[PDB]
């Protein structure tokens, strides 16, 4: 994130970390939309241009995290995926249309002060909140600046 | 452990929704209704954008009606990070919601 600030702990209880078993590394962000379903971008798993096609046994999902680096004992819940669903009309070639995928967890996670699901919009909320000018909020452990660096 | 560029702890940034025409005019790519763009305009002085590694993450909005947080988008793409005249793109969750329903509600919804 560029021009952001350190988040208060527990600020985004729905924040999920998509991580790779081997080699170990941060792959992407995601959101817990319930105790068993995680939402993320289809390109985080499938992007042929970069020779990327992760299946279920390559990824772990780390929920309840604050720090990008360390293993957070008390709060963090690491989990494995049962299923993976990439939108059938996902278009990586032309425009990255339908860039959406759902991760089904092995078994339901246990909510806490640090692990709570976000709501999905509904017609009325979409219509009321989605207006140019209105602000939303983005969170992540992504880079702080454009890269010419690591 | 940590450096500079890759942050140590989770980061946040509140961004304004940009109107569709402006988003379209901002890129040569064939934007779609399934995506929206957000970020400050060059005439705004305020900076801020999602960047590499933030992909898949949520773009949420807190409702002023009920006080719940809704996920409006997913960090999809952009052309670099925080360039003036450029806007970050995000998948349109409400528009793809019917598909989300179908798969969660066992291939039917």
């Amino acid at each position: 994130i560029v021009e952001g600030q350190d988040a208060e702990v527990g600020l985004s209880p729905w924040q999920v970390m998509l991580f790779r078993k081997s080699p170990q590394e941060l792959l992407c962000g995601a959101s817990l939309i319930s105790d068993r379903w995680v939402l993320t971008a289809a390109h985080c798993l499938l992007y042929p241009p970069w020779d990327k096609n992760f299946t279920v046994d390559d990824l772990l999902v780390r929920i309840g995290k604050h720090s990008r680096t360390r293993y957070e004992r008390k709060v963090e819940k690491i989990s494995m995926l049962d299923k993976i669903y990439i939108h059938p009309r996902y278009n990586w070639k032309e425009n990255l249309d339908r860039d959406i995928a759902l991760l089904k967890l092995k078994r339901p996670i246990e909510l806490s002060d640090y692990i709570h699901p976000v709501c999905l919009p509904d017609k009325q909320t979409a219509a009321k909140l989605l207006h140019a000018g209105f602000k939303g909020r983005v969170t992540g452990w992504g880079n702080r600046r454009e890269t010419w660096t690591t | 452990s940590v450096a500079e560029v890759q942050p140590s702890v989770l980061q946040v940034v509140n961004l304004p929704l940009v109107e569709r025409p402006v988003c379209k005019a901002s890129t040569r790519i064939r934007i779609t209704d399934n995506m929206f763009c957000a970020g400050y305009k060059p005439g705004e002085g305020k900076r801020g954008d999602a960047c590499e590694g933030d992909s898949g993450g949520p773009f949420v909005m807190k409702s002023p009606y009920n006080n719940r947080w809704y996920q409006m988008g997913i960090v999809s793409w952009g052309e670099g990070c925080d360039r003036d005249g450029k806007y970050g793109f995000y998948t349109h969750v409400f528009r793809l919601k019917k598909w989300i329903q179908k798969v969660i509600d066992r291939l039917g919804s």
Binding site: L26, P49, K93, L96, T147 | E52, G80
Partner: peptide, 12 residues
């Protein structure tokens, strides 16, 4: 071609 127009999927 997304890549051709400079489009950039979000770690490198």
């Amino acid at each position: 071609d997304f890549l051709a127009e400079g489009g950039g999927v979000x770690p490198r």
